[model samples]
Target: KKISGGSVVEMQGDEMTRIIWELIKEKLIFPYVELDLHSYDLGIENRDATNDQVTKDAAEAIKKHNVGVKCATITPDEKRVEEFKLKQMWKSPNDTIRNILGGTVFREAIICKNIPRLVSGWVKPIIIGRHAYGDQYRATDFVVPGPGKVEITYTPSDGTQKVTYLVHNFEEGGGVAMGMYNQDKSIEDFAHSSFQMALSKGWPLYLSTKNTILKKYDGRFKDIFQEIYDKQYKSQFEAQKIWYEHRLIDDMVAQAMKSEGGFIWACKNYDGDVQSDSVAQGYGSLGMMTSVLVCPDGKTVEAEAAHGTVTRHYRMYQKGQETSTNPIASIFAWTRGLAHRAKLDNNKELAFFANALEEVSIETIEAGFMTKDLAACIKGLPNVQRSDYLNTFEFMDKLGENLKIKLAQAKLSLEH
Candidate 1:
């Protein structure tokens, strides 16, 4: 029997993931769960045709529904524009969605027992909550050619005192200067989301910033997180046997490298961007990383794979060649998203089903039924043979069959 649950905002995407998204729904999700799916076609063609309004509409739907299960989308570059004949270079759907949502992205690697991590010390998962707004991404930068003085001025919109600061004075040579900023409100939201995630995972949280050097700039982030934690989350975290602390970015990186990996790290915008990729590679493959966007309210979430649309695999599939693309992270997007839905709805059966599916996905891989990527990770790429791993279709089918078995066993246990 399919488990019934609340409505889910389902945003489809581009390339090979769009294809995998359909199969995931058919074979794995639909067979086990009866969901009220608010489907939004976020496919590249549809996004272009709708003037990117589809993405805005989808974000709103997710806002309304409080749960979003998204497929990896294409953020088109100039080359993509020429290839797809897009109307214009549309903004990244993710950036657009995050702008509307105003939250942090938490990325974690889906660990399989057999898959070896580059950082062999990492037995558990290290979750990263990236403050994905402001700072470098929104920086105002300029090239200074034979400059006398570089200064920044701030005028109060409310007719208060105007303040000016000297950024630099170039005397000998030409240089560049940039100004970056973040809001207290945004930082507060980031703190809340990071705290909520840490509590949800029942793990300690660490906010990383170079507060020692960028005392005023990064110090604000450090102070805001500490303030929020002490006021609202301190008691709750203590009760959960967890705590929140701030660490120097440099020290945090070294600690993260050596630690056994059972904590959440909240990073500034740019640091998160670089560290997330580094952590993803350290785990094994991007194909095994799962991402969840957590809203400040802790009531809304959107889940997807950390990796982009498998472009290389998509090209091969288009040519009618066999492909063995890893879909574990995509599968986790469904499980993680639905798990949040189940939590909100207080649906134990739905939660159990989601858990079962996730376990089956991981267990299937551990049982030696994996994709080409994992096989390559275990036995170097040059040595991997076709028999060692399953193709895209075969892997999905394997998970589907194993899920049925898992659910049947659960039902049997319940009957007894």
Candidate 2:
């Protein structure tokens, strides 16, 4: 297998993860892979300077290259606005990026044998694919002080068609509200991107919704996915021995609790927002969560760590104190993005390289080389010490060494 090179658009950001970001480049990335890197500094100051235009440009670049690996940055709140002294409180760079990309965010945990999951039954990591664009995130409603009459209506594009529903009322003081939505185009895209991701991983895909209750609203999601499956995905999924099915949210959660996992759980915006944290805690550490954005075209992707900027660790580092922060998720961000690039280019060697890197991450952690969060997970409480894990730089150095050895062995094996 020959190595085919690809381009990576790298975006740098703020705080502790920002520091770790540089170490990743120097120790892990440059040491093993040789390729073109289009770098953009999206630190708070730069984002402010560009009026957040840098983020847009970065997203466009990732779209063009079909791969991006981003470091965590601060999403300003009231305090952040005061601290960074920003012109105003801005939305998360992720939100900006996601809007530009128009894709689903899939988060998966990087599991290690030593990490203790909150849910002891979750032996394998569960990947959560979030439809980040619509549903509750965009619903419109108003609370009624005294219920008289409440109704919901939808007017079709064809002027002659109209649908209306009356809300149930009881003889008591209560609230009345209604919300409606969705374009066929967006739902179709969501279904395609999700099925594409599941097929890529050869994993079963489960779409979750409250379709049993909201027959008309949630049922649309189920129907859209079913239509796509019947028309396009069914044959491929069956051939791959992977399947797609819709489950009620409660039942899905219960099943997830008891099952031995290896599947993609497709979720709507609100469900994803609440469940991803549960899945992350179940997997052991936020540092272990890797996020990837998959577009409808199945071509473009942007990968990053699911957790935010490591402020506490960054504060300690500011005092010139040694800090041990987990870099596995950030490293996997690069590998996963590169793996997709490899898939697009059909470069088996590049794919092998990514596989080796991911294996190295798991192997290193299972060998007891880990960070404080993982150490705490292993110990069952907060009694982790230096002896239990390697510092940020040391672990990265180990990964670099491991990657070199693996690449060399792969090269030799290929020659034979």
Candidate 3:
């Protein structure tokens, strides 16, 4: 039996993104491609009903199919748990998905000519691949008192070699110390995935760490990436005229602040958490960020908007007010996922289709048609009127119309 022209499983969620999600399918997707959409309504209510089991099932399905496009969903807090009347406070679906897929989350900015970035020097988009697990987020944290010593020990499963290190000690005054670690396997996977993504995009890759301070701890990261680069990815990286290098975390941030965008920054879990937001802000708006999870295998992938559920805008929509929610990220979620699907299938036509859709989205925005968030990024905002930005439905329709024209033109050009 035929797989029937690429399969995409969409998991949706609450608020303004939900509204834009429908518009994207109707106007941007359905007009051009016949999609096998296995949709799971992951609204707050549905998540509660299944006790978040549905999220796991959806992620597993994506892994099986090798492609998924997801909209931003809320990861409920205490208040959210009460408000939604959820069974329990559920973790983010993205966290669940990433755990199942064992991939690195790379966030990319959607470049628009009119959007005024906070960092004016960035001419291109800087892609950030964050190692989303371990380090500080999973550190065994504590406070130290008096002149006490802290130590970290690692025991080999085979009982051949045991390693121990003294973290620190409070000498003159009260201080704190904590120990963190990364397995050889996980770091190797991260290195390979980062290199693969950079090679695929033809971009240089940089890994950032504070190796100068935590020489042994952060140095392990630097050493692993170097080992992988020298032994495995060096020739391929050099052939592509791209390089992989490591920089001190402070230097990386400072350089990123001053440099023109276009490179991929491979960040450890903690640095990624802090710097990704900086990169997103530098790119202008979170609404324009596109995220993808690329596994070490370089085959299975998932795409989604980098922003969260637009709850404030959803409230406005509920009151029957017209809301201009940005749909570009959500639309690109599908485009990127489908593009990966094309690559996996080795179907150039399918790849071209994805490219065309992505191009249409950017062209539409560059033509001075955008949403409120993007409009705020545009210069001379006071003079910018409703005509400067299209509503949720209209912008998508414009994308659809433009995509058709572009596709037809491409076809005619090919024939001629």
Candidate 4:
């Protein structure tokens, strides 16, 4: 059906998933659907070749066309710089893309019935969102001298009174000084995106901040969220029997650790960065977490796995070693994105196909079929045997075969 009339701004990536990316398209995607894709190579080499214009272009295309599917790409560290022989240690393609797109990146763990979680009590997914734009992620800091005043000055363009706020006055001691910011617009956009995301999932949203301490700084985030929720989202959220609330960062952390899960936690930039990892690890495997970046307008999205490029596995794969890498999250990345297109186009058939693919992914894993990482999650690595999971290629083949059978059955069900 030529994919029920829409396109994905597909961004190719790096390392192991780059390898998995092509096989995924070949076996799972291209076979079932013919899609119009505005493709861009965001692999490190290509990003460098295009001077990172490729990343910029892909983000822009997502804005123009409104849907994106990305593979886990290499964000170079010093060793990677030497290995890739990069022109520069470019800023994260994701950071660039998010700046261009302006949204919160939310990741939800894919729950499988048979995959035992570290927090065995969690039966449902806990969606974690990061306010991706500011805070320490974009902060300036320096070593400070003894007996000096550290101050912040805000100057007006029209030459009004320049305001100065005293950050600190070092009293006969050498220390560190730092400053950060979160724009009203960015926070407002984050609020919009978070609310939209929670609504889409039909879950309550909680914003965590240090407002009690930061008062003006962190308090603004709390205030902004309250204002938006009270004015705009409160009704929609309540109608869905969901809600939004603000929590002190410490209390939120404590509560999150003890909770059974099922709600969306919309965190300030710093909290989301730190907590998503904890949530991912507690869920059992980072490989199972699916990340989605949703813009304030809710018209654009970039879907991908939250995990990084599997370089360790890639190294093994290079030497003719059989690596058992998990591809479920990457598979879900494709479906989530294509499903977005289906919704935009109102293509019920395409939506059904996408949903079936996702259902088959979970069902495939729950049926005692998976890769090494997941098998290790279920049974500790020392206890895991070779038969416990499939090789990388074998896993994809299993998912492909299962998806085909699932789709065929779904078609029959509809035919009646």
Candidate 5:
């Protein structure tokens, strides 16, 4: 019997994972639960045809429904533009969505006991909560050509004193300069989201900033996090025996590299961009990392894999060659989003089913039925044998079978 889960904003994307996205729903989700799905085609072609309006509509839908599960979408480049034909280079679907949604993106690894981590000591997952609003990504950069001076002037909209600060003066030669800004409101929202995530996980939270040098710029981030934590989240965190602190970015990275990895790290916009990828690499492969966008309210969420569309594997698939791309993260995206829906609706059966799916996924890999990348993780890439792994289709089938058996046994036990 299929249990009816509540409404979800479902977004489909591009390349190799798009193929797996359909399979995941067919094999794992559809068989167990009926969902009121609001489907949005975020595929590159559709996005281009609609002038990326589909992306906006999808973001708004997510806002309404409060739970979204997305496949890996293509953020087109020069090569991709030619490959796909027509339309100018569209902005990254992620950036567009985040701009509309206004939230923090938390990326965490899906750890398997069998897979070897690059950072051997990190037993649990180190979740990175990235502050994805204005900073370097939105900076006004200019190439200074033998500049006389570079300054930042802030003009008050109201009848107040205007202030100007000299950023730098090019005394000797040509230099480069830029201006960046972040709002207190956005930073406060980031703080709440980060606090919410850490509290949900029952783990400590650390906010990283370069307050030593960029006193006012980064200090604002530090101060805001502290203010929010003290005023609102302090008691709740203490009740859970978890705490929040601000750390210097450099020191935080050192601590993260050596820590056992059960904590949430809140990063400034630019720092998060760099550190998330570095931490993802340490976890073994991007294939095993899951990303979630948590809004300030802790109600709205969009789940996805941390990795991009597996273009190399897709090229081979297009040529009728065999591909064994990992799909666990994509699967988790579904499970994570479903779990959120379950929490919101208080749907116990849906929660149980979501948990069962996640368990079966990890159990299947631990039982030595895995894709090529994970097999390569255990045995050296050069030493990998064909017998050691299954192709992409075969692995998904294996998971489907295992999940069925697990569910059937549960039913039998319930009858007993």
Candidate 6:
């Protein structure tokens, strides 16, 4: 009965998850764990209201302190623009935090036996370690005039000899040119995380980049990872039969396509931005994906559901229609974060409680109890019936009920 969850920077988010976020604490969280939540509203309106200062502030809060958990959020596409009517398109809150925190994102699929994957060969968990700091995400670009010249350059303030390259010369009316950069320090930090992340899971790691073309640029990524592995990690890796290798982005994609799911695939920014979604769809649904941003030092982390705020569910909730939205990933967002808090505090009881929550939540689904969202993933959505899955409120009640029983059984075991 003694559960002590350390303080976490609880970042509130938007839409349906926003509504669900509140009840989770009321029913499942606060009841079990004594917590001091540094609450910050990250709703779309609030982000616009504060000009996204809350996001930057929250990122800093997590740094000096420890754990933080977030509900799913909106990235504001064109449709969301009209719905919220924002001043300008704000950047992704996740990307903002990752940049400020100086880390790579490791996303893992929460494996459930009931759900069937599109990829027939995958039996193990596939983790995507994304180098989210630079590349296309931070590129500088502009449209060229009818006839002009363009160049890429880096000038040091020390009056050092500047490095410059002639990028293009427009003969007729034309397109655009982009200058993208990735720092050596950032790459080295990212390399440290890749080795550590793989070692933590005891899995093989691969860095995917087009080193053949951008030999100097992408080659830095390969060389950095290789250098770190050879110098520091190769012995650690080979001891476990785990190896670090580099692959072309194209070849990596093909290898991933044919092989069974297991190892962590390290990706450059743009590839990660696109590939995480592709890999998630193969595993099953976004509602089951778990994301963690781990800084290079390996002590800090920010955990959340990989899926976005359920706007559709929120709309129905407005009309007062009950929905069967999946809360598995959202629940893990808190459990996973608290598990870290447990590690930090050295609280075995609290660790037991959090791990049990994960186990019970999975068991509840395996017992033929789930949400409509996940039910659709198992059976065709057209064939899914209300009888197959519980409503949002009902599903939450089921987990809470099972979790109480689970904790009681766990505490009972300590009697010996």
After superposition, which runs of candidate 4 have C-alpha atoms over 4 Å from their true positions? 1-5, 140-151, 164-179, 196-202, 233-243, 412-416
lDDT, ranked from best to worst: 5, 1, 4, 6, 3, 2
CA lDDT of each prediction against the hidden true structure:
0.89, 0.82, 0.82, 0.86, 0.89, 0.84
Task: Tell me the TM-score of model 4.
Answer: 0.90
Per-residue lDDT for 1-416 in model 6, tens only? 54777778889998888877887888788888888778878889999999999999999889876788988788887787888999777888887887788778888878788988878888888788888697777777778866888988878899868998898889889788888787889888888888887898899998899999999999888988988889999898988889888999999998988889789889898887678878887887777878877777667888887777888788899999988778888888988998988888898877887898899988998888898877888899999988888999999999889988987787678552
Pick by TM-score: which candidate is best?
Answer: 6
- lDDT, residue 308, model 5: 83
Q: Lowest-lDDT window of 10 residues in candidate 5? A: 407-416
lDDT of 4 by residue, 53-139 (tens): 999889889999999999988988788889989888877887778777877888878888777788766777788888878777667
Candidate 1, residue 231: Cα displacement in angstroms equals 4.8
Encode model 1's per-residue lDDT on 261-350: one tens digit a residue: 999999987888789878987888778887888877769999987778989999999999999988888988999999999999999999
Give the worst 10-residue stretch by lDDT in candidate 2.
132-141
Minimal lDDT window, size 10, model 6: 407-416
- List of clashing residue pairs for candidate 3: none
Off by over 4 Å in 5: 138-153, 159-179, 200-202, 232-243
Error of 4 at 299 (Å): 1.2
Clashes of 2: 0
lDDT tens readout by residue for model 2, 250-346: 9999999888888989998778777887788787887888788887666888888878788988899889988888888888888888898788889
Instruction: Quote the lDDT for 156 in model 6.
Output: 84
User: Residue 358 in model 6: shift from native, Å?
Assistant: 0.6
Which of the two, 4 or 5, has more lDDT? 5
Evaluation by lDDT, superior candidate among 1 and 6:
1
Quality of model 1 by C-alpha lDDT: 0.89
Off by over 4 Å in 2: 1-4, 135-182, 196-203, 212-216, 234-243, 408-416
